[PDB]
Phosphomannomutase/phosphoglucomutase
Amino acid sequence: LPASIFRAYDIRGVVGDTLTAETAYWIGRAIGSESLARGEPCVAVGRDGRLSGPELVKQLIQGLVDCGCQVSDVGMVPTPVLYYAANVLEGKSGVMLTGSHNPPDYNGFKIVVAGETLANEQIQALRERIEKNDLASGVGSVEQVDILPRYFKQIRDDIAMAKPMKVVVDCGNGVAGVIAPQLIEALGCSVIPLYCEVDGNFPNHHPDPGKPENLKDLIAKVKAENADLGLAFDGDGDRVGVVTNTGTIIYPDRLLMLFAKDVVSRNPGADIIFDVKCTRRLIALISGYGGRPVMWKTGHSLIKKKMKETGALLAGEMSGHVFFKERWFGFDDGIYSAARLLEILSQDQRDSEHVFSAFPSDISTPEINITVTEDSKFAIIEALQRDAQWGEGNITTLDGVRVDYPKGWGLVRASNTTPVLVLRFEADTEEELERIKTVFRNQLKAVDSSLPVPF
Ligand SMILES: O=P(O)(O)O[C@H]1OC[C@@H](O)[C@H](O)[C@H]1O
Ligand SMILES: [Zn+2]
């Protein structure tokens, strides 16, 4: 199999190119073998609404069965519903067949084995099992499990909306359409659906709420319908995007401020995790409410591992993966997070625009991406970590280099999903924003004067 599909957080490829039915089978065999090695014969399997789902999921299941595993086939569900299954069924292992927010032809595997979400060397270990034929053999079984109603009920029973809300819900023709509009209605909302038909061709916009262009239709509908809030889900439902009644995009780091206040209010001293892409304003906010802010690496699998390490009750990423442990299970879930948000907003007499505008804000850049090579991106970062000079500030090298100054911050890191360098800048004035950008531009140039600096 191609090595390129085995990434830091999960397995991801293009069907008909780097991913085939045969690939899914052997990946199934590798996951089954690892699960068995960890004492777990029971594995849940889910798939999103992609065109290739039916073909690949059958092979993934057969690979697991051929290890001797007992598979629980939960059918077509959002990613968090698969994670849910791997928390409430007999087994603590689960595999989700998903291409996340990517174009129609993409697919992949998100993997939990004996409670732990695999990343880094563990994903490489799967690749290595297949190369070595270090694989279990046995006569397993498959049982169909209808888990969506249990998930639905578990959320509905945990949430208490104080007053009715009107909410536009954009599923991007992804799999969140199987539950999100129905569940949000059941919580006590009027729901205006947008692109909620599950359609793996994604004929409307990419199901990627992290890009403002993909929220354009949502913003317009919120305004046209006088809605209280707009919500968007990514293709597999583990990311959420948020729009106020006035059409303001609420980025996930600011969403996390509202959630952090909520969680810490009931859990003094709770650890709250956020990734290196999130606003410095989060650090002060969590600390002020008596929480312990923990900055960590970008990447859903890595955040999940850190949750376990720290006992954190809540985590969030700038990309919109939000992880509730309090009242929940600790995995990322856009649908649950949407429910938690609606609960909080419903208990405030103010509109969603004013609830969010109350929090301090910096001036933030849109994300900067610089295309480099897959085989040079980590070396550029290593070079910066070795050689760079940042002036006076708090320097963090846990993921790339982030520097926090008195009045702003900057970040450069390697993407683990694309051959690019990712940069973020934010400051409380335009002047400071430019000063920080200049520092970073000069440090990049000092490593390699030929690097593009599109900022
Ligand atoms: O390409 P990366 O930045 O490495 O990862 C992205 O895709 C995975 C998400 O968990 C991250 O938050 C998102 O930023
Ligand atoms: Zn996703």
User: Anything to note?
Assistant: The pocket of 1-O-phosphono-alpha-D-xylopyranose (ligand 1) is lined by residues 9, 298-300, 317, 319, 321, 415-418, 422 (CB under 6 Å). The radius of gyration is 22 Å.
